[PDB]
Symmetry: C2
Subunit: 192 residues, 2 copies
Amino acid sequence: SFELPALPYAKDALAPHISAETIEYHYGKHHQTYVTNLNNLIKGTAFEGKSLEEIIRSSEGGVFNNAAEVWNHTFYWNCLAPNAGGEPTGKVAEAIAASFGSFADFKAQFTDAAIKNFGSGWTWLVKNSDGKLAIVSTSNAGTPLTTDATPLLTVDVWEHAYYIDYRNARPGYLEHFWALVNWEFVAKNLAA
Amino acid sequence: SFELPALPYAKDALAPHISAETIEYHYGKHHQTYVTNLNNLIKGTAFEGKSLEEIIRSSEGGVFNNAAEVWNHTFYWNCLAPNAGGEPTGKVAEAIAASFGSFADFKAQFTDAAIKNFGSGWTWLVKNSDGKLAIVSTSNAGTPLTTDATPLLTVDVWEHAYYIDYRNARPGYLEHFWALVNWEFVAKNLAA
Ligand SMILES: [Fe+2]
Ligand SMILES: [Fe+2]
């Protein structure tokens, strides 16, 4: 009985970086469908009373794809915000500087990883179990939740995430992604 | 060095099933970029002098992804045509009827497979070396060329192939795909 969590802002709040139309389809159709599909697939199964994270860590096939995508998108919406972007400060800035050399280095590494993540997928900033930050990419519904690394930030590189606004120019999408990064969410994730 | 083969028709030939803008981007940007990236990866290497097929059957990583996608798209453009679609005749009709019972059954199965293919990929009708026909789906740049089967027909289900025209409605795209199938090409593939 999972529900589609409410968007953290107005559907046109990320314009012009991500259009209101993209949110309408991405959130209203894609994300909503993953929720509906997940609910239908777990009915009557041992997954019924489990948390979303629990299902993601104990499933495969269709149940996994839908559950992971539900979580990935909710995390994604929280990674964005209006009147945000720019450079992080405090603990996040310090951790990024220590793990990548500088914010600029991190930004270039994250951008490159995201652009080169072949096909559909996600690119993440995570804190590995060794306490150091790293950038990793996943394919399709893949998520760091199935590992011992903690997700801090992500960018959806499935084409539906940017085709309406940037067509083939995934790099253009990444450029604008930086103008939307919600460092408050990233900071919360790192502080946990 | 590889050249992007000319499209078998003007970019408006498949409209309204596939729009001129989709062709503009799909052929003019996506396909072209695969050619460019392939060229840059193989320049000055032992992959020079090799056919596209030879590269696909002897590579991995980026070389394979780009080489395979170049071939897949050229094959795809030949699978589509104006004033086509409908149902096959002659040898193609016979083979499909013998393997799937009827064209209607084949059509339903191919469509179902294409819709279910998760993430980016392709759905194919192939002929195994023993003469049996089968429907197989691949992920990302995956192609039957790396197997023992012969590609007869394919549909691109990467989101860029249909998002401009159908957004998330991949089923609608598949319906319109059938109005474009170039059975003459399929017959050539089967007769080889
Ligand atoms: Fe998405
Ligand atoms: Fe394509």
